[PDB]
Structure 1
Amino acid sequence: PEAIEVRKVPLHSVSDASELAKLIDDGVLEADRVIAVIGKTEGNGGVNDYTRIIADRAFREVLSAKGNRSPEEVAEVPIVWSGGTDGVISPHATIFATVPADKVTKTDEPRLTVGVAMSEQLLPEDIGRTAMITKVAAAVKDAMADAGITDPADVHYVQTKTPLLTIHTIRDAKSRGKTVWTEQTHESMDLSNGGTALGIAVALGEIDMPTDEDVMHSRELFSSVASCSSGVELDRAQIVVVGNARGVGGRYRIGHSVMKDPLDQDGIWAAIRDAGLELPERPHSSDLDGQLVNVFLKCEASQDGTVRGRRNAMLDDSDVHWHRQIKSCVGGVTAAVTGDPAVFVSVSAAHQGPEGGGPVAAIVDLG
């Protein structure tokens, strides 16, 4: 594994990658050393969200223009866009790049490492079933090794992008005598993320191998580091593993915890603590002093329709889906911790953290 440089840049428009271009010009990182991008785009966050492909193309063109890598090489860089920036959430991209050896001093302290992998092809009949779980788990171990990590406890954040079900793939499944878990395009999104999350939890040894009946139903089964996204651009699981390794060097370190509910700011502080920042007992955003790069977390409205004993009407709201409602709410909860509205807040959290909450990972600048 290599030492990693991590930069979070704003998007000034749906098609803006100029801040990545500026980092390259200022020599903060090298175009060809960019190995992964994880960001938030200002689309609706649902099925018909096309701000993800716009941002995807704007960034790959900067990488192709400013580096010696060929456009075919750039296309292999995993870029994950979580649509939907309700409320104060600021569209942004977190850039992961390798550092040249002559810029790193390797320490025995744990420092940030990144691994990437692509699973075997996921067919429409795999989605949400043990076939998806097993294929994802193998890819997660692959990306884990690529990061130079052997201990699952050193994995703090796993970001994925998996296929959805469409009319075309559903027809494809049935034209070979296969079945699909569901035919609702919106619901397959939660299904794809859920099955992928269980895969992550298996590879990392957080749970025992579950059954087909567990997916979307056994919500006590979950991963504490899984952040799963789905879409249509790819028929494979794209895996990005972010963790720590000793003896690699670098300035950044990752840690994680869990949010037990949408208001659990202490869970976020716990992730920042676990990432290696020493903070006061009751910390405030002003205590961070520039040292928080970003946080990455999931959230969801709980099955019981309550938070801390108080009823809300999210699950009954046919006007604005609870996906967008809870995203905005936790966006404010999270940005109030970090002091920076540029936060990675993502919805659809089946088997991703405890029911009604989600995992939270934090990357900090330690030097």
Structure 2
Amino acid sequence: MQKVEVFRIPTASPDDISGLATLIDSGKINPAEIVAILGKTEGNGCVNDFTRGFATQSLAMYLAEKLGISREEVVKKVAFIMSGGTEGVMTPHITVFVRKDVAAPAAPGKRLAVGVAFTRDFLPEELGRMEQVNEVARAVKEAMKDAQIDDPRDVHFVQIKCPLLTAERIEDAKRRGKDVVVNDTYKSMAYSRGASALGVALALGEISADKISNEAICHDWNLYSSVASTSAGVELLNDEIIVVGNSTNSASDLVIGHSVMKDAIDADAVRAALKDAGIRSDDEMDRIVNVLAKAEAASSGTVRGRRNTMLDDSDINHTRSARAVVNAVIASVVGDPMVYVSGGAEHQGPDGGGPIAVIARV
């Protein structure tokens, strides 16, 4: 019997650990049982965002202190998914997943259950290709069993921190005779997010294996997962995977539902995600623990037949604008901008859309 608790903590800066320090000193959280931390940090969420690593370093230093272990050890034990980009009204915050297995009669029905798994370090020429998909698809199966979920349909969200291609990993693949998927480091964020997402779909039964190839990755937008949520960063060379869903063998005081935004202003999907997780009135909104969603600019350059400038705007990266938009739309349904939104939804929802999950109190 594993129980899961989730703490959404406001943060004053990327290195702010006080909110997690207040819940530990109070005993509401025992640090030894922390399995993952999902963060929105206030850099630009693109290539040169060092708030990701700053936030992970600051958290790792704090937990190594309170657990008496080394920073490197904490990194191997706890999944740090730091997603940069807090545009518009999006509030910086972290979500701390605690997994405490306690003996107790199991909640009839199904309750929140979380699994984590790491993949091996990829080679740069394996970034954004079938070997990233297959490897990620494997680790998702192992994280899914570590959560005590057997049916791939009890899964409602799969977060992933994935690597990207830097100038050194290009040369660290060129002098071995290997070409990389793309030359632009920014473009490799799309290829890393996308290949990782096709891994979720492959292991969850959403898309058959015959369809997936090198040429499909970031090209056949008909292929996509409905629960995958991948975020790239420079501070790593493997993929870290968090599987969230519902399990009969769970005692959590929480459930997780989801839906899929058809486009960036699909407030209907926000409300359906809310209803899939036991929130059906505007008064029950106070049971939200967090809302987690993908955003992206549609490749057509339109939303509902209306042109926008996201793909033409040379001043502001289109992932920055997508995040601002989708956060604002979710904020306006739940009346709270402190919700996880991440940009670049390659193979995560249809082109121009992305999955959205709500974790709510029962």
Q: Report if TM-score (shorter chain) is over 0.5.
A: yes
Contact 1:197 1:350 in 2 (8 A): yes
Contact 1:20 1:62 in 2 (8 A): no
TM-score (norm 2): 0.96
CA distance in 1, matches of 2:83, 2:42: 9
Q: 313, 316, 325: which is aligned to 2:321?
A: 325
CA distance in 2, matches of 1:327, 1:100: 35
CA distance in 1, matches of 2:242, 2:294: 16
Contact 1:115 1:242 in 2 (8 A): yes
Structure 1: where are the runs of 5+ without partners?
Answer: none
Q: Residues 220-275 of structure 1, C-alpha deviation per residue, up to 9 Å, x if partnerless? A: 10000111011222221111111111131110111111000111111011112112
* Aligned match of 2:287: 291
Q: Residues 16-45 of structure 1, C-alpha deviation per residue, up to 9 Å, x if partnerless? A: 110001111222110111110001000011
| Residue 358 (structure 1) aligned with residue 337 (structure 2) | no
Contact 2:2 2:249 in 1 (8 A): no
Contact 2:88 2:324 in 1 (8 A): yes
CA distance in 2, matches of 1:112, 1:272: 15
What is the Cα deviation at residue 62 of structure 1? 2.6
1:214 aligned counterpart, secondary structure:
coil
What is the Cα deviation at residue 99 of structure 1? 2.7
Q: 212, 218, 221: which is aligned to 2:220?
A: 218
* Aligned match of 1:7: 7
2:357 aligned counterpart, secondary structure:
strand
Aligned residues: 359
CA distance in 1, matches of 2:259, 2:21: 33
CA distance in 1, matches of 2:162, 2:100: 29
Opposite residue 269 of structure 1, the aligned amino acid is R
1:152 aligned counterpart, secondary structure:
coil
* Aligned match of 1:307: 303
CA distance in 2, matches of 1:100, 1:142: 18
What is the Cα deviation at residue 120 of structure 1? 2.3
Contact 2:47 2:234 in 1 (8 A): no
Instruction: Call closer, same or farther: CA 1:133–1:289 in 2, change over 3 Å.
Output: closer
Contact 2:148 2:249 in 1 (8 A): no
What is the Cα deviation at residue 118 of structure 1? 0.9
* Aligned match of 1:79: 80
* Aligned match of 2:102: 101
* Aligned match of 1:240: 242
1:24 aligned counterpart, secondary structure:
helix
CA distance in 2, matches of 1:69, 1:26: 21
1:255 aligned counterpart, secondary structure:
strand
The residue correspondences of 1:126-141 to structure 2 (distance < 5 A) are 126-141=126-141
Q: Residues 275-302 of structure 1, C-alpha deviation per residue, up to 9 Å, x if partnerless? A: 233x14xxx4xx2342001111111111
Give the root-mean-square deviation of aligned CA atoms: 1.4
Instruction: Call closer, same or farther: CA 1:289–1:296 in 2, change over 3 Å.
Output: closer
CA distance in 2, matches of 1:121, 1:69: 23
* Aligned match of 1:341: 337
| Residue 174 (structure 1) aligned with residue 174 (structure 2) | yes
CA distance in 2, matches of 1:109, 1:181: 45
Opposite residue 93 of structure 1, the aligned amino acid is I
The residue correspondences of 1:35-114 to structure 2 (distance < 5 A) are 35-76=35-76, 77-99=78-100, 101=102, 105-114=105-114
Q: Residues 35-76 of structure 1, C-alpha deviation per residue, up to 9 Å, x if partnerless? A: 100010000111100111111122223322223555443122
Structure 2: where are the runs of 5+ without partners?
Answer: none
2:139 aligned counterpart, secondary structure:
helix
Opposite residue 259 of structure 2, the aligned amino acid is S
Worse overlay, 196-205 or 51-60: 51-60
Q: 227, 230, 233: which is aligned to 2:229?
A: 227
